Amino acid sequence: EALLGVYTNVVEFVKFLETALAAACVNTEFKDLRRMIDGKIQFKISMPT
Amino acid sequence: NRGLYTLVNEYSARLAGAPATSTTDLQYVVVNGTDVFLDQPCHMLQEAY
Amino acid sequence: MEATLEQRPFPYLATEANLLTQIKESAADGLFKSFQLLLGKDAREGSVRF
Amino acid sequence: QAENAARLGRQVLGLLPPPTHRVSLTRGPEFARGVRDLLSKYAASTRPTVGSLHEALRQAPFRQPTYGDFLVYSQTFSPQEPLGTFLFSFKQEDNGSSMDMLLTPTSLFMLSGMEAAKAPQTHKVAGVWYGSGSGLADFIPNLSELMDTGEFHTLLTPVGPMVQSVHSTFVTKVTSAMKGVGLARDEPRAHVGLTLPCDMLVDLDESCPMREPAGLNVTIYASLVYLRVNQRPSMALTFFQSGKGFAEVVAMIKDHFTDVIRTKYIQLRHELYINRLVFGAVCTLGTVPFDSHPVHQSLNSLPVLVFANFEAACGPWTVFL
Amino acid sequence: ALDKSIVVNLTSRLFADELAALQSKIGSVLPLGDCHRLQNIQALGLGCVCSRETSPDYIQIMQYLSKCTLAVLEEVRPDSLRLTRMDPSDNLQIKNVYAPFFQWDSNTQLAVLPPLFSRKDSTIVLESNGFDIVFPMVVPQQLGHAILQQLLVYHIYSKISALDLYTTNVSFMGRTYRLDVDNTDPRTALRVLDDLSMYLCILSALVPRGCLRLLTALVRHDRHPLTEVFEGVVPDEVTRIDLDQLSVPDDITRMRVMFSYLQSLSSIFNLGPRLHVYAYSAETLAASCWYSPR
Amino acid sequence: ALDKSIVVNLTSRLFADELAALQSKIGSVLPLGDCHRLQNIQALGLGCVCSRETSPDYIQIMQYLSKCTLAVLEEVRPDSLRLTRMDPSDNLQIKNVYAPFFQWDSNTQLAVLPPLFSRKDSTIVLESNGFDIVFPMVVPQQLGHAILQQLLVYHIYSKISAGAPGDVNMAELDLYTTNVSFMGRTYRLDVDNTDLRVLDDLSMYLCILSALVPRGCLRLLTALVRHDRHPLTEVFEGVVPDEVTRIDLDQLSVPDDITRMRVMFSYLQSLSSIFNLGPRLHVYAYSAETLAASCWYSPR
Amino acid sequence: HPGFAMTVVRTDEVLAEHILYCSRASTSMFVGLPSVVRREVRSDAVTFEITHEIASLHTALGYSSVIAPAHVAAITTDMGVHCQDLFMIFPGDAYQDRQ
């Protein structure tokens, strides 16, 4: 009584950058969240009259 | 009580007013913080259909 | 230690999209946190202090 | 032929306890470069490799329990074993030089003399291991009177699992294990877990969602209940498994042995004997890892549990009531 | 070797209000449920059993306390709490803060207890996250056992009310205090007081006659300091029990079982886990302890 | 990786007569109030608590025991004692040099009890440094939880005779207490007819308990009526004596009963911990011709 | 008919496949560097928790993502009729005569 067909799965790798979800992203490389506390972006809204 | 822009910024992200469980036998009140996906709009109008 | 706001003159960056829409009421009822009005005798690059 | 002994220079000089880390000062600030396993967070990369984390697994914690070498007759201790049983050490008087008596839990059922259907599973199996429950009772003529005053729970020091048994005609060598994880013998690098009969265990954990938190620990206990059947004294043994702390389980064991308290203490309306008032004891048999699945087995049938990664830790026989 | 670091992800940035209470308690103890590196905030505080809108009793809370793992804070970043764990044999840096302040030394003897005096002092509420955080409380074991005394005594006298200077004020030499009892649950406190009937009336079943004969000789004229409780008058009972002639091997059989049941009374006066502290500075307010769940 | 050693220094040397008494042992069990390796002599004995001019005690020793740290000898140099630290769940070696002699066995439970016998059995006076070292009384746990048993009986009847002569017979009391039975063997011990005082404090408690205890259970019975009243508590009327249940609350008003019940359990928890929390170990290998007891320290 | 009429509340659950729009480039992404932490080390299991930390951000000023209930699929609710039982929620409350 022999052995007939001995099979697997092979799972591929779809990363984040190769998707196009990242139009809702701006992907900056960064080195140390183990230092940084918060972030800060500043704006000025000058309104004419 | 607040002006409604915080109500917009609350309704998209946060906990409900103590909502109900899913895939059970009865209706339990939820204590597992992160699985349940619900959005209930019975808050904002504060009525019942 | 938080990350708060102050009124100091950076060389602010010139964006492209307009941002004036609903800011008559968006900062009035908290679209975002920690807005800051400046009226006429205050809408200036205030003097630096350190 | 020293090529044989050159293998012995490998295994012995590699398998030593780690030396006391000591540096003389004239070398200077070099001592901390001999500090390795105190680190934990290693070096991740883009595509790491065995060649990138061979240092991360070269360090290893230092663990070894110690064993108890026993000499047993071929009569108390059965020639067949499932190699992962539980033990005791009966203790009456040091007659022999090295002449030890041991008790498996399947034996200790037959020593008791209780009803059949109170433990229906092993009773068919524990009748072919041993005789009519009297070949062992010939060794202790006090097994009626050890039951009276309540001294039998004082005379048991649990040991834990097994490791090896070389068996001869009359004398059986038993290499037991306390303190932890015994390295196996017939399969190298394996680790002999603890095995319980499915009849003798009674869980305390299991519930419907109705919620209790996890941890690191869950603790096998060991009950021993003096009952009286047919106006004749006879003990009773069960097990437990609950990661719930010592203050809870004593309040939960009493609900399990409710009727056994209810049967006996009706009889003391007309009499009282102060030696009879003691009821039971609980030892601590050690710790089990959290959420390790007890895999069921079967032996000629006999459903037998297993606990991987059991480590042994004995304790005193604290009386309860 | 082993590592422990429990960093706590959090869904909303904190305010400037409750950082300043959490910056104050930079090193403390709070027990969690799920033993992993990442964790939702609805497991950190003790308030999964002790919230406002229940009627918590401090038996079940204390009963809950011995289950969970225990952990020590490291930082408060404005999003992420960062915590470290307590292994079953491990040294660490505990650094006490707790507000009814007691003084420690090296070679002291500690316990972990629920908030038993002022919850509003001991609990901060997190209205920027909804789920509140309830702190436990570390007490030396002489007072760690003394609080549990009157609690088991107060639930008795609350039942016979079916006034307060005697049944609540837990005393230490120098400072008396006040327990926190208005809304408790007298059912699982009753289950502990149930089991005392299963000991205390059985401890009354074998009471030695010679030891009762000694109190027909001690408090009559041979008194002592610690016998002022009787105030110089014998009770009615001891005049009724000691009519029998003594004999030694009667009480030998008796006192061996009295020796045994008092070992069982450990099972009903258990603390949580215990902390054996070996070194304790006094101006840093730091310490050093090996943990043992028991 | 770790290293452990405890080196005790002395101010002066020793007499050559004392070294033979400290080569009587070379491995034994010392308590030690420090965990650090350089230390003056005043903590390794029990003379930190138990001394001659002090009233000797049992409980104030016993509280100090479980707090304390053990350590084991390796060498007696003429100036400094060398010790080996007793880690939690560590295995090391003992020689059973103790007095009065008891025989050990593999697979016994071992409780470290304080000494309560005559001085020459337990202590060694260091005549050089004027300080007394006291050794603890290493007895196996089944014996240690029974060697106290009949001795504590013996102290109670001694207080009976010295106030009332015609109640206790001395031949009955001597024959049944100082002859401890175990293993099939016997051990006659030192009765102390030299004048006791180590074990008043338990008998100071246990009698003052034993009148309060049965009076305390009546109020606990009639204060529990629910349908949560536990079903086993119906039975235990048959255990409690009939004379116990014939007591009114007339003699003791409400403020008196608080001084009972708030104090009742305060004995028991001070009392239950000093029968249980001996720093305890087990011994798994033993040989009488070498006298090598074999610890592994369970911190408790 | 007893002395009073009464209102009734229920709840509901309905599954839905949602269309979520997200406009362009309204989050700047700060991606950290990964690390390996070893723990829960018994004699048979050496467990690693490979971690990685991200700082996210909200660049645009107004709202840059809209969700919408689109496709009904099922009703888990049953919309049944079954009342809530104060004998379960309040077990301690009871009448006087226990018979």
Side-chain angles (χ1 to χ4, degrees), chain D residues 31-103:
Chain D
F31 61 96
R33 291 182 181 91
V35 176
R36 296 293 177 88
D37 59 350
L38 282 73
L39 187 145
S40 176
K41 294 184 181 179
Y42 293 100
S45 68
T46 299
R47 185 179 295 113
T49 308
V50 174
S52 66
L53 295 178
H54 66 277
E55 193 272 333
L57 297 173
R58 184 176 176 85
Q59 298 297 320
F62 181 75
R63 297 288 185 272
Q64 191 184 5
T66 70
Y67 294 158
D69 290 331
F70 293 159
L71 192 147
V72 197
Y73 294 104
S74 70
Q75 182 176 358
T76 61
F77 183 77
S78 70
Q80 293 179 355
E81 289 300 324
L83 185 63
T85 63
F86 185 69
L87 284 76
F88 291 97
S89 296
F90 184 72
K91 183 68 184 298
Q92 185 60 257
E93 182 177 0
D94 291 332
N95 200 3
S97 65
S98 181
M99 294 301 292
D100 194 0
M101 184 181 294
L102 272 65
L103 295 177

Side-chain angles (χ1 to χ4, degrees), chain A residues 23-28 30 33 41, chain G residues 24-25 27-31 53:
Chain A
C25 293
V26 174
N27 290 318
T28 60
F30 182 67
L33 198 147
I41 293 177
Chain G
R24 183 183 64 186
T27 62
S28 66
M29 292 304 294
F30 294 106
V31 172
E53 295 172 356

Side-chain angles (χ1 to χ4, degrees), chain F residues 96-237:
Chain F
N96 59 7
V97 179
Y98 293 99
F101 183 72
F102 293 99
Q103 185 66 41
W104 294 100
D105 192 0
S106 66
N107 295 317
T108 60
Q109 297 181 355
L110 279 80
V112 178
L113 278 77
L116 61 95
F117 288 167
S118 296
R119 298 293 296 164
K120 295 183 291 295
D121 291 333
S122 177
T123 187
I124 293 175
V125 181
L126 291 176
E127 293 292 334
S128 295
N129 293 316
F131 181 73
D132 293 327
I133 64 171
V134 178
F135 293 104
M137 184 180 172
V138 178
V139 173
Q141 182 177 3
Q142 185 63 40
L143 277 171
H145 289 172
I147 192 68
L148 189 145
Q149 186 64 48
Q150 296 179 356
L151 289 177
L152 183 59
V153 174
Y154 181 72
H155 186 273
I156 297 170
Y157 291 96
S158 65
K159 299 292 181 68
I160 297 172
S161 65
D167 290 332
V168 179
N169 297 115
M170 294 298 110
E172 295 291 329
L173 180 62
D174 289 332
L175 183 60
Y176 291 162
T177 59
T178 188
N179 291 319
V180 174
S181 66
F182 181 72
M183 192 64 75
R185 296 178 176 181
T186 60
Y187 292 100
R188 184 177 175 87
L189 56 89
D190 291 331
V191 181
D192 193 1
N193 197 1
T194 64
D195 291 330
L196 276 75
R197 290 189 298 272
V198 179
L199 293 176
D200 58 350
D201 289 329
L202 294 176
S203 66
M204 290 299 292
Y205 289 170
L206 288 178
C207 292
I208 293 173
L209 269 81
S210 67
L212 291 181
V213 166
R215 178 65 177 85
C217 200
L218 188 144
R219 187 176 179 85
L220 193 145
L221 287 177
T222 64
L224 295 177
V225 53
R226 291 179 69 189
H227 295 279
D228 193 70
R229 179 179 282 172
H230 183 78
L232 296 175
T233 66
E234 191 273 334
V235 177
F236 289 166
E237 191 273 333

Side-chain angles (χ1 to χ4, degrees), chain D:
Chain D
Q1 63 184 356
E3 295 292 327
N4 192 3
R7 291 181 186 271
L8 274 78
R10 297 291 185 270
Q11 292 179 358
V12 171
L13 279 73
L15 182 61
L16 294 174
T20 62
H21 186 193
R22 184 181 294 114
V23 175
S24 67
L25 193 145
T26 61
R27 186 177 290 172
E30 181 66 26
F31 61 96
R33 291 182 181 91
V35 176
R36 296 293 177 88
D37 59 350
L38 282 73
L39 187 145
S40 176
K41 294 184 181 179
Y42 293 100
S45 68
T46 299
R47 185 179 295 113
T49 308
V50 174
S52 66
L53 295 178
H54 66 277
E55 193 272 333
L57 297 173
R58 184 176 176 85
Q59 298 297 320
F62 181 75
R63 297 288 185 272
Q64 191 184 5
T66 70
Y67 294 158
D69 290 331
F70 293 159
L71 192 147
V72 197
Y73 294 104
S74 70
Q75 182 176 358
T76 61
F77 183 77
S78 70
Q80 293 179 355
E81 289 300 324
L83 185 63
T85 63
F86 185 69
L87 284 76
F88 291 97
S89 296
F90 184 72
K91 183 68 184 298
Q92 185 60 257
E93 182 177 0
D94 291 332
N95 200 3
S97 65
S98 181
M99 294 301 292
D100 194 0
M101 184 181 294
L102 272 65
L103 295 177
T104 63
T106 63
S107 298
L108 186 54
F109 181 72
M110 295 299 289
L111 276 77
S112 64
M114 69 181 80
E115 293 291 330
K118 299 296 186 291
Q121 183 65 43
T122 61
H123 188 198
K124 184 176 180 179
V125 181
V128 75
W129 294 102
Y130 295 101
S132 66
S134 67
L136 293 175
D138 289 332
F139 290 164
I140 299 98
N142 288 320
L143 291 179
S144 67
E145 291 180 356
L146 292 175
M147 294 304 294
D148 290 330
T149 61
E151 293 180 354
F152 184 78
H153 65 278
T154 63
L155 298 176
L156 293 177
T157 63
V159 177
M162 293 173 65
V163 173
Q164 189 181 359
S165 289
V166 175
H167 181 71
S168 293
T169 300
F170 294 102
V171 173
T172 301
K173 179 69 174 64
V174 173
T175 302
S176 67
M178 294 180 183
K179 286 181 186 183
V181 179
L183 181 62
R185 293 294 187 271
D186 292 333
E187 294 181 352
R189 296 297 185 266
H191 296 279
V192 176
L194 184 144
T195 63
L196 298 182
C198 294
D199 193 358
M200 293 298 173
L201 190 144
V202 173
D203 195 356
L204 188 60
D205 194 4
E206 288 178 354
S207 297
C208 306
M210 186 67 203
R211 185 175 176 178
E212 295 178 353
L216 187 64
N217 193 2
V218 51
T219 57
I220 297 175
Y221 289 160
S223 68
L224 192 143
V225 172
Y226 293 156
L227 59 87
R228 291 179 68 188
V229 65
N230 292 318
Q231 294 181 356
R232 294 178 67 188
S234 70
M235 68 187 76
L237 183 136
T238 63
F239 287 146
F240 292 101
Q241 180 177 3
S242 65
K244 294 184 174 63
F246 184 73
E248 301 189 2
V249 183
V250 177
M252 294 298 290
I253 290 172
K254 295 182 182 179
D255 289 332
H256 186 199
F257 293 101
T258 299
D259 291 332
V260 178
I261 297 170
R262 292 178 67 87
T263 53
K264 180 184 286 187
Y265 291 169
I266 296 172
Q267 296 296 107
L268 56 84
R269 180 65 180 88
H270 295 89
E271 71 271 15
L272 191 148
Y273 293 99
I274 301 171
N275 292 317
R276 295 292 187 274
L277 267 70
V278 64
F279 182 75
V282 170
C283 180
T284 299
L285 295 183
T287 64
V288 175
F290 184 71
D291 70 3
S292 67
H293 293 168
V295 179
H296 295 83
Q297 296 295 323
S298 294
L299 295 175
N300 59 3
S301 293
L302 184 62
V304 173
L305 292 171
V306 72
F307 293 101
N309 285 313
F310 181 77
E311 63 182 3
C314 181
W317 292 98
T318 62
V319 181
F320 66 98
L321 187 57

Side-chain angles (χ1 to χ4, degrees), chain C:
Chain C
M1 187 64 202
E2 295 291 329
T4 61
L5 188 149
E6 64 183 1
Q7 292 84 13
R8 290 178 183 169
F10 296 162
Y12 290 150
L13 279 76
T15 65
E16 179 68 27
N18 58 357
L19 297 173
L20 295 171
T21 62
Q22 296 296 319
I23 305 298
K24 181 67 179 294
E25 292 88 4
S26 295
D29 291 333
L31 181 63
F32 61 97
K33 297 297 290 186
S34 68
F35 60 95
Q36 184 65 41
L37 277 74
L38 293 174
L39 294 176
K41 68 180 73 174
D42 292 330
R44 68 183 182 274
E45 292 84 2
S47 69
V48 63
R49 65 184 68 187
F50 61 90

Side-chain angles (χ1 to χ4, degrees), chain E residues 107 145 149-150 157 159-160 166 169 171 197 201 204 211-212 215 237 240 251 255 259 262-263 269, chain F residues 33 67 145 149 157 206-207 210 214 217 219 225 233 241 243 257-258 261-262 265-266 269 272 276-277:
Chain E
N107 290 320
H145 296 179
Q149 295 302 115
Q150 178 52 254
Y157 291 92
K159 183 66 183 294
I160 300 167
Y166 292 160
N169 295 319
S171 66
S197 62
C201 278
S204 71
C211 191
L212 292 177
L215 293 182
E237 184 176 5
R240 298 292 184 182
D251 290 334
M255 292 298 287
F259 183 82
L262 266 58
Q263 297 182 354
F269 292 100
Chain F
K67 185 173 74 175
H145 289 172
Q149 186 64 48
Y157 291 96
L206 288 178
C207 292
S210 67
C217 200
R219 187 176 179 85
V225 53
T233 66
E243 184 64 33
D257 292 333
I258 302 298
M261 295 297 175
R262 181 180 165 92
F265 299 105
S266 67
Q269 204 179 357
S272 69
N276 290 318
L277 294 175

